[PDB]
Write a protein that binds this ligand. Structure first.
Ligand SMILES: *[C@@H]1O[C@H](CO)[C@@H](O)[C@H](O)[C@H]1NC(C)=O
Ligand SMILES: *[C@@H]1O[C@H](CO)[C@@H](O)[C@H](O)[C@H]1NC(C)=O
Ligand SMILES: *[C@@H]1O[C@H](CO)[C@@H](O)[C@H](O)[C@H]1NC(C)=O
Ligand SMILES: *[C@@H]1O[C@H](CO)[C@@H](O)[C@H](O)[C@H]1NC(C)=O
Lengths: 97, 48, 35, 49
């Protein structure tokens, strides 16, 4: 909640360069994506969390129950971070690394 | 997870697309600008 | 940039047949009809 | 993916989307069939021999 902005996301240090007067930041889809911290005047980027879904590669339940998981386009040096696998149950983390 | 999305106990071979079905309800923060702009409340409340 | 802002649940899945395998298909087609 | 598009990450929005339900299953499944048909189109157009 910055200056009357309501939303959900993950805040990280950003790189864009604002103007002395401009505060918010909007993307092509007309949504807030960059917000300036009111107290200390740097710029924070807002990113979505909770990767919506994956694709499971499974044979028929007749044969077995072992499955593969495909992540859509993500470079997997950070899939333990992108999935937030730290909070997952130990069964999921088998397919996380 | 792909058993839950299909709403069926047996799933045929192939590639599916699952829902999220996972959650981690987090905390919240509210940052608003520095408070300074104090009032002359002390003047009216405290006097002789 | 083209697909940067449109990760609001929308994705552009890549074609299953890549551009180089289709190239080999066309090469086979052109190498069969000339001999 | 509806749960992402129709509203961003939010518990109660998905909770109330549960009431509508099967539209999304019909909408996602509507687009997939299209994608598989696209792959079949390319396969049948190019792979004759
Ligand atoms: C993934 O990230 C690593 C580390 O920077 C890099 O070496 C690798 O090339 C990346 N993969 C792709 C496909 O860009
Ligand atoms: C399992 O096998 C039986 C008999 O072979 C078959 O009727 C059924 O469709 C199979 N189920 C699958 C492949 O999910
Ligand atoms: C709020 O307090 C901090 C710490 O004393 C100070 O650095 C900052 O300048 C204050 N806010 C404003 C708008 O000056
Ligand atoms: C008024 O004076 C009292 C006692 O001197 C003090 O405790 C208080 O903080 C002062 N200010 C207000 C707003 O009461």
């Amino acid at each position: 909640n910055f200056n009357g902005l309501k939303g959900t996301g993950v805040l990280t240090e950003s790189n864009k360069k604002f103007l002395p007067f401009q505060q918010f930041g909007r993307d092509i889809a007309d949504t807030t994506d960059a917000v300036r911290d009111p107290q200390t005047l740097e710029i924070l980027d807002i990113t979505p969390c909770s990767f919506g879904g994956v694709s499971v590669i499974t044979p028929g339940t007749n044969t077995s129950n072992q499955v593969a998981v495909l992540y859509q386009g993500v470079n997997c040096t950070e899939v333990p971070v992108a999935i937030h696998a730290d909070q997952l149950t130990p069964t999921w983390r088998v397919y996380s690394t | 997870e792909t058993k839950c999305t299909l709403k069926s106990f047996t799933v045929e071979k192939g590639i599916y697309q699952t829902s999220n079905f996972r959650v981690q309800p987090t905390e919240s923060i509210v940052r608003f600008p520095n408070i300074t702009n104090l009032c002359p409340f002390d003047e009216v409340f405290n006097a002789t | 940039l083209i697909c940067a802002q449109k990760f609001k649940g929308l994705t552009v899945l890549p074609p299953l047949l890549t551009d180089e395998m289709i190239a080999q298909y066309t090469s086979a087609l052109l190498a069969g009809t000339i001999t | 993916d509806c749960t992402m598009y129709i509203c961003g990450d939010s518990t109660e929005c998905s909770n109330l989307l549960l009431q509508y339900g099967s539209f999304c299953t019909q909408l996602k499944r509507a687009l997939t069939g299209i994608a598989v048909e696209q792959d079949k189109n390319t396969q049948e157009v190019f792979a004759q021999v």
